[PDB]
Design an enzyme around this catalytic site. Structure first.
Site, PDB file in Angstrom:
ATOM      1  CG  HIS A  60      59.611  18.673  -2.594  1.00 14.41           C
ATOM      2  ND1 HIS A  60      59.553  19.403  -1.428  1.00 14.41           N
ATOM      3  CD2 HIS A  60      58.344  18.269  -2.846  1.00 14.41           C
ATOM      4  CE1 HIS A  60      58.306  19.443  -0.994  1.00 14.41           C
ATOM      5  NE2 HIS A  60      57.552  18.761  -1.837  1.00 14.41           N
ATOM      6  CD  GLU A  62      64.236  21.722  -2.850  1.00 11.29           C
ATOM      7  OE1 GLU A  62      63.855  22.457  -1.918  1.00 11.29           O
ATOM      8  OE2 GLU A  62      63.448  21.191  -3.658  1.00 11.29           O
ATOM      9  CB  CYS A  90      60.088  21.994   2.406  1.00 13.00           C
ATOM     10  SG  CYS A  90      60.570  20.277   2.017  1.00 13.00           S
ATOM     11  CB  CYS A  93      64.441  19.880   0.386  1.00 12.34           C
ATOM     12  SG  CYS A  93      63.293  19.059  -0.775  1.00 12.34           S
TER      13      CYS A  93
HETATM   14 ZN   LIG Z   1      61.231  20.032  -0.210  1.00 10.12          ZN
END
Ligand SMILES: [Zn+2]
Ligand SMILES: [Zn+2]
Lengths: 168, 168
Positions: A60, A62, A90, A93
């Site tokens: 992701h 991040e 999320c 992260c």
């Molecule tokens: Zn994430």
């Protein structure tokens, strides 16, 4: 208590930089989410979602930014840092942000389905984990949400073409 | 409903393999936690905590194993897989496990301070995230907890030596 290392213009600059990261994912047909990590007014880490391209489930925005920031600093600790991300992080992260000891996080639009900062969970401010992150939201939310809408529309179009080619 | 792709002996073999990963971290003076990801009775990913060595905040055993498993399969999806980890996954790893679509997780000892599966949170079985992971715990818990105790004792000893050398 509440810290303000950067003006609204500086913050806007950084979120726009995260939106530029977001554009990279869009162009590659992936969830358009971008992230930038700043230290002393300088970006030390950049990231965008690249799960499909990298075949990595943790890729992701991040996570990519954190890896870059750690490399830059040559330290897993990211103290006195500010993380800008186009969409609310999320659960994975958020947990990562806490482990990096990032004290400041600013995100654009909320993530009502997988949000781990305010939506579904409040990981960055959870006392049990003692994360004491200062969270700010709404920065360029309209744009962050807009590029996401573009992604979904394009996704339906790609799905329509694929359905057509498979048929006949 | 409840699946059993592996016998108790097979499970024991895999957790012991994760304990061997755990030994790698110990030897490097890091939290002794290991992880192995299995597909069709074969380990496709291995990992151990290496935050200090890698200078990466996300470098927990599960994250390393997931990256390895994704690479092996050349796919971010890890369906029909079983993850064995010596200690209950934290919030970050739990989130990652959900994103990888790993349907089966078995851990040894619980993590009362940062546990995200049963202790502090229940991320792998959270309906909101629709994670529907079958979780099993207790496999070789004594050993998983023991190597951790060894780590903490050694940590105090290292801290005592350092304090002595700094002084005079
Ligand atoms: Zn994430
Ligand atoms: Zn973890």
């Amino acid at each position: 208590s509440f810290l303000m290392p950067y003006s609204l213009e500086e913050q806007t600059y950084f979120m726009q930089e995260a939106l530029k990261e977001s554009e990279k994912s869009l162009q590659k047909a992936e969830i358009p989410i971008g992230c930038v990590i700043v230290k002393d007014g300088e970006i030390i880490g950049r990231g965008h979602n690249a799960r499909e391209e990298s075949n990595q489930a943790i890729m992701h925005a991040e996570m990519m930014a954190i890896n870059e920031a750690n490399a830059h600093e040559g330290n897993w600790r990211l103290l006195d840092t500010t993380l800008f991300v186009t969409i609310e992080p999320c659960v994975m992260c958020s947990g990562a942000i806490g482990l990096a000891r990032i004290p400041h996080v600013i995100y654009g639009a909320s993530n009502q389905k997988f949000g781990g900062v305010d939506s579904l969970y409040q990981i960055l401010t959870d006392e049990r984990l003692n994360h004491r992150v200062q969270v700010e939201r709404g920065l360029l939310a309209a744009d962050c949400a807009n590029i996401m809408q573009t992604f979904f529309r394009q996704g339906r179009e790609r799905k329509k073409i694929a359905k057509h080619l498979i048929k006949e």
